[PDB]
Design a protein around this ligand. Structure first.
Ligand SMILES: *[C][C]([O])[C]O[C][C][C][N]C(=O)C1=[C]C(C2=C3[C]=[C]C(=O)[C]C3=OC3=C2[C]=[C]C(=O)[C]3)=C(C([O])=O)[C]=[C]1
Ligand SMILES: *[C][C]([O])[C]O[C][C][C][N]C(=O)C1=[C]C(C2=C3[C]=[C]C(=O)[C]C3=OC3=C2[C]=[C]C(=O)[C]3)=C(C([O])=O)[C]=[C]1
Ligand SMILES: *[C][C]([O])[C]O[C][C][C][N]C(=O)C1=[C]C(C2=C3[C]=[C]C(=O)[C]C3=OC3=C2[C]=[C]C(=O)[C]3)=C(C([O])=O)[C]=[C]1
Ligand SMILES: *[C][C]([O])[C]O[C][C][C][N]C(=O)C1=[C]C(C2=C3[C]=[C]C(=O)[C]C3=OC3=C2[C]=[C]C(=O)[C]3)=C(C([O])=O)[C]=[C]1
Lengths: 462, 434, 454, 428
RNA sequence: UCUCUCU
RNA sequence: CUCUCUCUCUC
RNA sequence: CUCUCUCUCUC
RNA sequence: UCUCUCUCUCUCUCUCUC
RNA sequence: UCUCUCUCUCUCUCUCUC
RNA sequence: UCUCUCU
């Protein structure tokens, strides 16, 4: 049981080491200095170069249908250099085959797609913490208020099962609803070989959505949605109902700390063997890495570097939809809602005035650290029954409804509504779990927060 | 009929006396004082030394494949000494042959494996009362909520039939499911001489599981599981069904009070001849031994000694999965569920700060005493799943089992006048792990 | 139909997969025993290889051998006579193989599964060869049965390990002999039918009575078997009653399945030739065995002063399980006259240890038939109601006496007296040509002896 | 076949276990009677030991001896003449033994099992010896049968305790004589065939008639024996047809099983040599008895003026039950001419009390045969039809066509040696 | 000269 | 019937 | 309901 | 000669470049 | 992508009283 | 790891 855990840690560390040494090689090939190599924007550009080089289907499409005034075999992006204290942007072009060769040499001749998926999740978390997706929500017919379920909405299809665990209930519902809308518009959807392929995709997406849900009624309803040969308006409405139900009876969304490649590259250049030490995306390793890492960023004139650092921290730990109170408790500084952040996105546009732009250090440090969870809370585990030890008269208790429900009407909407009506926004989940100090590597002594003072806000996008 | 009972008591007392005099000899050889000899952690270390010395197969494997920076012929453990009121831990190493010689001399030149199995059951009960096994449950595909059937999950294979009676339905189902999973992955399982041996093991484990069950339908279903030449997914699912059915139509799991060796050693040094008086693991003897025994333990800073004492009491009487109401009635103090116990495990890790650690006396005393039972209560065509489901559907969590049986006062040695509890006041919790 | 095509296709693939395993296993064993093409195609060598497999998977006998080992023979090794041709002369050397080694080789050939269907297929092939070669009248008399009912002795040498598949191919006479031996042991041993074992024997007795009952066709015969089954302590009354049942089967023949189980050498040669039985499928009652034998060349050991054609006819008879079939029909299908057993100038196929393996020569077996027919699981030899479709005032007729009619020994005797040895059975069904793979145009024959064992 | 190989191997082990018990028990009794190697190999000693065991397990006679004790003999002790050679000369002393002690020794030698097969095997050996030595025309004349059918008296001395196995080896004449005694008892006693005991007698009469019917071969003989069985009150008429059936057996011979039951001394010697009959197996109709006798040395007590060769021939014939066989075939198998009974200069093997055990010397028995053959349970090939059948029968029809005699070195019986053939009647 | 409803 | 039966008796 | 039951593999 | 109350780590691979 | 009125002209079976 | 057409 311990051996499997140590191999898992070694494999994750291998992925991290590959990403870091690729970043070091890219910094060497780009002639970036230490400061320029630690800039988050340069790392964003380099990661996007990697992702676009290995986007096989898009590359093939670009070869078949060339873009306007662009070579389909070259990637690029903005690389920022400091000359005499002034920042300037450059568009430098790299062959896709060269990028692929460098990445494979970084991973010891292997095209490790796990690191690519890691960078993809990092970008998705950053986009989730920065930009809202209300327009896409409204277009598909879902309420703009279920933004908390839209984690991982920018993750592309090539992420696969690794990225599927990260995307929330809202994004899966949105994709299924898009499929149903396409089927409603054109009946030739779900017909032909493409029809068989899209039916398989629909079944697989419904199955992973079902795995996301926790209560039996939600699983039964998504099962009923999956069983329809030609899903129409009814299944789209049922999906919307399930998405709204996910606000109270939450789902199992996997949260991982995917740091920018600059941190990994600095760690690998420092001499940290992730293969020997081991890495975990849900434990203390990202926190320990972020505490002793220095990252720089570009601050547009009249912006608050503290707000940008908070945004990057939230993106790194995928805490965009987290309660502001617990996020502030872990960070030690107030996590300000999105409305009151005097900052724009991390990425710099091509039309910006690259003469008033400044540079600031990012405060990616937290007082406490906590375990990142897949669970969405308790829906209402333990000991169901008693095993008698003493020969005493006594009633022998057991949880009869829970035992029987595994051994047994067809309208589960009423049951779901009843379950959500029973719930109150005051129940305590994750009982007995707390936040650990940075020195508590083994997570032995937890600290439970007491939020029973004057009330701060709780929703980042509120 | 009485003569056989008195010989059984004499044999059990012989085992207890051997364990106690071994503990006395070990305390003499370790230069432990009385307080240090009564510490539960030192007794845990000594018992683990005994078990590792006599773990023949592991010792042979260690000789063939040496461990990293360890002598395969030496056992050890943390021994705690008090100097100027400050506790300090020491790692002292003892030859395995020396430990075996001392143990055999304790049992009069005999390698009494019964005492080793007794210590094994004590450790298993402590682990059951302290640590939950939900990860192993989920890995094997069983619900994490059938923890009440996982009694004796940490018992090693060398316990045999004595330890097999103690392990519950959940652990046996889990082991059978592991075997089925191994067979599913590799077809060379159940083939060859190893295949014949593992088929024999599977049949024996199925037979003792069948003996565990009470109703005829459960026995028929486990019989059908046993009869399959190549058990696959269907038998694993049927085993899961039987495990879930065991929550309502419970099984026959044997409960024994296996005390730490410190209590036995103190009793033997006091002058209690277990051979002449006789010992029973299901009667008043463990209660009477625990009432007049003093045990010390190490309390980490910011812990409740009452909660640790309750944990040790539950471990001693194997009441981990017991109803909290009856356990509190027998103890006289509220048995708090695991979630609200402000205490960690008994054992101290090697990385702990051995300068803020304190010592506390363990309150292993109960107001009443009760007989420990093997029974799981009263239970009242070729597809017996439907029949089992019907039987469980008939049952309600209000039926009274063990009718006419009560808890006896400590002075009632012969168990003559029972006391029946009336739990008909405001409801406390009932599940320890809830 | 139109739904049983799928089921027919499923069965063909499953049998083809079994045939593939036998061929794949034979090829592996041939390369491991170091046998050339000629020796690989020898029927005697294939017999030894097949018997080695059957003994390696005999769990019960192997256990008994371990507990009570024989003298000089360890119960973990099997083997048999392997015949090799060196310098033109033939020599026999006894090969010893570990049963675990043979079991692993067989399992590896069938993709790691036990595949007892392949073993039962080989056991049926041995039973067919035994039936066509040797006549067991001594067992018939020893059990008290009349030695004249040799036509019902189909599969009398099949071991009990062949259940279902073996039981379907075995005949009424063999089934009755099994019942009689159970009865005799009960009469001799009073403990029989009593105790824990008596319960096991009773269930075994019930099961084989039911399968025997399903073998019969007339209602009178089935009712007679049903009575015998009910007897809690069977004795002489059931002994005589079953004897009457066997005698009745000569006229009111039961349903005995007939399958063409070929030697493993034929399958091995076919599989080595790239032939894929699993893909195109197979059938033991269709044209597949006939087409395989046409293209297959098999050699055998011929003892001095033995007609090679007569041995080839014996192997041909065993291949198609036509030992008890009419000589005229067998002669028509083969194209060359089939001779009775008394006029066959040959001994058994299997060569004995005490035989001088120096005057022995090998010959090719002529296992080719001019025609091909479908093997039958049947023996020899209207509307009574109405279902209205229109709403009219008519009266719905039914044959009342016949419907209520279906709600011993004199009746059976009356049935056989009416029967005569001239009734035409299988009316309109004939024999096809090898080029006619779809059974489109039957060729009805027009027909001096007709008894092989006469 | 190919399925009866397992059955044959199973039967061989069961017979070998019986012989092992016989050999093991003899070894113990020799060690417990304190018999030397020479005395243990004496055929007279082996018979005495065998007779002690058979009487020790005779429940009915033992019960009658208890209820009605004999004069000077307690019914709980058995024994016989044991011949011991010390100082060159032979002497006989009666040994007395508890029947229960003998029973325990026999049972312990058979792993605690009764092993009634071994006792019957010894009983068949004694019958074979009696048949070759003594001719019982007195019983034939007393029962009303013509004394000329002495060829059908095979196993006439076998006790009724040997059921199944005993009945298989006994002949038509013995079966007829048993029935004739039943008829004579019924005719004399009117209460016979009536009452509770009459029912028991009727079932015995039916069962022994059934085995006689199975002993016959021609359909005519079976039907007539079927008629005799159906008689509820058999009398003189059933007397006659049984006599006629016996006379027909001289021409239309029945199927009588022939087994080679050797003396216990041979088995004891073989077991002491380490031979494991259970492992190697045994058979009473195959080569095993012949191969055992070739390597076995046994001695006998010779009365003065007696030819050792004739006594050895008598033992050889009794061993293989060739008392009523053709002398030419017996001579061909043995290799030395077999002499008829009238020309044998020897008396019975057993020595009587009234015989002076002082002029008696011992000789080695030549129980070795040049050839070996397989013992047969078969013969060769209303009432007017029966007489018609035996009229067509001639004493020249060849039987067992193509079946011959093999060599001791040919253990698989691969190459038969067909004989080509002046008397042929032992009792003639 | 003993004790017990209900593996 | 070239081997394929025998666990005993009107006990 | 106590007791001997002894362990497929170090796990 | 080890540690732990209370499944969340890991391979899952992509209907279409979107 | 077959054929047939009217008793099996094709529909196995995943081995044994282990 | 045996042998046999046909009491
Ligand atoms: C079990 C499972 O596998 C099941 O699944 C189901 C689903 C899938 N499918 C799909 O996708 C498809 C199909 C199809 C078809 C159809 C449809 C409908 C109806 O009704 C009919 C049909 O038919 C058919 C098909 C296919 C093929 C064939 O052959 C036939 C489609 C079309 O058609 O196009 C598509 C898709
Ligand atoms: C009564 C009782 O005893 C029964 O039991 C049963 C079970 C046991 N077994 C086991 O475990 C085993 C077996 C085996 C075998 C087999 C299998 C399967 C089949 O099919 C066949 C067979 O065969 C055999 C065997 C063994 C031995 C011999 O000889 C043969 C195994 C293997 O094989 O490996 C294992 C186990
Ligand atoms: C065998 C059967 O029957 C069962 O048994 C048991 C029960 C009944 N009982 C009897 O029988 C007996 C008993 C006894 C006893 C007694 C007697 C008398 C008196 O008084 C007392 C007593 O005690 C006792 C007993 C037993 C046991 C115990 O524990 C006690 C006897 C004697 O003793 O002897 C006999 C018989
Ligand atoms: C299989 C089942 O039973 C589970 O398993 C796990 C848990 C329990 N345990 C066991 O069994 C074992 C352990 C071990 C170990 C040890 C021992 C001793 C000492 O001292 C130390 C140690 O350490 C460790 C281990 C394991 C793992 C880790 O990680 C650490 C063993 C050895 O070592 O051999 C065996 C068994």
């Amino acid at each position: 049981e311990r051996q499997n855990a140590t191999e898992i840690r070694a494999s994750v560390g291998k992925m991290i080491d590959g990403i870091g040494r690729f970043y070091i090689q890219m910094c060497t090939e780009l002639k970036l200095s230490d400061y320029e190599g630690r800039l988050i924007q340069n790392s964003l550009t380099i990661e996007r170069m990697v992702l676009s080089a290995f986007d096989e289907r898009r590359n093939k499409y670009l070869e078949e249908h060339p873009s306007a005034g662009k070579d389909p075999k070259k990637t690029g992006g903005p690389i920022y250099r400091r000359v005499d204290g002034k920042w300037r942007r450059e568009l430098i072009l790299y062959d896709k085959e060269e990028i692929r060769r460098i990445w494979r040499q970084a991973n010891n001749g292997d095209d490790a797609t796990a690191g690519l998926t890691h960078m993809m999740i990092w970008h998705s978390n950053l986009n989730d913490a920065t930009y809202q997706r209300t327009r896409a929500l409204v277009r598909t017919g879902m309420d703009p208020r279920m933004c908390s379920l839209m984690q991982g909405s920018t993750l592309p299809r090539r992420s696969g099962a690794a990225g599927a665990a990260v995307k929330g209930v809202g994004t899966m519902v949105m994709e299924l609803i898009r499929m149903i809308k396409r089927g409603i518009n054109d009946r030739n959807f779900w017909r032909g070989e493409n029809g068989r392929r899209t039916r398989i995709a629909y079944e697989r997406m419904c199955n992973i959505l079902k795995g996301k849900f926790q209560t039996a009624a939600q699983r039964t309803m998504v099962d009923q949605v999956r069983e329809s040969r030609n899903p129409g308006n009814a299944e789209f409405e049922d999906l919307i109902f399930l998405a709204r139900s996910a606000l109270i009876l939450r789902g199992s969304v996997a949260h991982k700390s995917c740091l920018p490649a600059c941190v990994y590259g600095s760690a690998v250049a420092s001499g940290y063997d992730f293969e020997r030490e081991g890495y975990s995306l849900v434990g203390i390793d990202p926190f320990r890495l972020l505490q002793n890492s220095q990252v720089y960023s570009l601050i547009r004139p009249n912006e608050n570097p503290a707000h940008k650092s908070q945004l990057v921290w939230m993106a790194c730990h995928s805490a965009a939809f987290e309660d502001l109170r617990v996020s502030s408790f872990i960070r030690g500084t107030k996590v300000v809602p999105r409305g009151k952040l005097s900052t724009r996105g991390v990425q710099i546009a091509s039309n910006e005035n690259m003469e008033t732009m400044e540079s600031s250090t990012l405060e990616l440090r937290s007082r406490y650290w906590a375990i990142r969870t897949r669970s969405g809370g308790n829906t209402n585990s333990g000991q169901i029954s008693i095993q008698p030890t003493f020969s005493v008269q006594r009633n022998l208790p057991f949880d009869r409804p829970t035992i029987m429900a595994a051994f047994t009407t067809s309208d589960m909407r009423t049951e779901i509504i009843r379950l959500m009506e029973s719930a109150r926004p005051e129940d305590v989940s994750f009982q007995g779990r707390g936040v650990f100090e940075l020195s508590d590597e083994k997570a032995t002594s937890p600290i439970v927060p007491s939020f029973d003072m004057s009330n701060e806000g709780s929703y980042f996008f509120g």
